[PDB]
Design a protein around this nucleic acid. Structure first.
Ligand SMILES: Nc1nc2c(ncn2[C@@H]2O[C@@H]3COP(=O)(O)O[C@H]4[C@@H](O)[C@H](n5cnc6c(=O)[nH]c(N)nc65)O[C@@H]4COP(=O)(O)O[C@H]3[C@H]2O)c(=O)[nH]1
Ligand SMILES: [Mg+2]
Ligand SMILES: [Mg+2]
Ligand SMILES: [Mg+2]
Ligand SMILES: [Mg+2]
Length: 87
RNA sequence: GGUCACGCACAGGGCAAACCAUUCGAAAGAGUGGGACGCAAAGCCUCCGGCCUAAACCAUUGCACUCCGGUAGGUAGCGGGGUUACCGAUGG
């Protein structure tokens, strides 16, 4: 189940792309090295985020310590992602 | 001369990009004033395609690393199409 990238769900869809990036970057940065944060506001990608950590241990700590977290008045739903391509 | 085209001019000229000031706007962008990159319809119109914006509303819980909700607004100086018009190369 565990993975380098975490998949963040049920996000407030009214927050702009670049404010959400910055807000996620300042929150999850303490858990470990963040490679990139994937956020877009298209129909299929609304309310969603992919936070990529350099190591799984930091991602597991990120997933468990902040699951169900109140974020812009919405519960954060964290599960693992399936395949981190990029490069 | 008319009409429909056309732009090698002539002639009166017309408009105004970027930038700046200011107003409106959530934004894209628009108005007004200065200002000219250009423009033979760079006059006018969102009917079709593209591009740009996302405040409100409706819809959407969606696994991405081409891009993509409806809607609403915008660009006519992004094309196409519609419409109106000045000059007239011994002009076609
Ligand atoms: N009266 C008239 N004359 C025409 C027309 N078409 C061509 N000409 C003549 O041909 C010249 C070159 O035209 P252009 O290559 O379209 O190049 C033009 C054009 O791009 C632009 N321009 C000038 N006036 C206008 C205008 O009222 N509307 C537009 N869209 N462009 C203009 O400036 C350039 C130079 O203009 P000019 O010194 O007048 O010089 C013009 C003019 O003498 C027309 O429909 N009516
Ligand atoms: Mg002249
Ligand atoms: Mg002016
Ligand atoms: Mg003409
Ligand atoms: Mg308009």
């Amino acid at each position: 189940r565990p993975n380098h990238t975490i998949y963040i769900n049920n996000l407030n869809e009214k927050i702009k792309k670049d404010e959400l990036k910055k807000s996620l970057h300042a929150i999850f940065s303490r858990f470990g090295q963040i490679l990139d944060i994937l956020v877009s506001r298209s129909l299929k990608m609304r309310g969603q985020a992919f936070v990529i950590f350099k190591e799984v241990s930091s991602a597991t700590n990120a997933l468990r310590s902040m699951q169900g977290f109140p974020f812009y008045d919405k519960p954060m739903r964290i599960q693992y992602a399936k395949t981190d391509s990029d490069i």
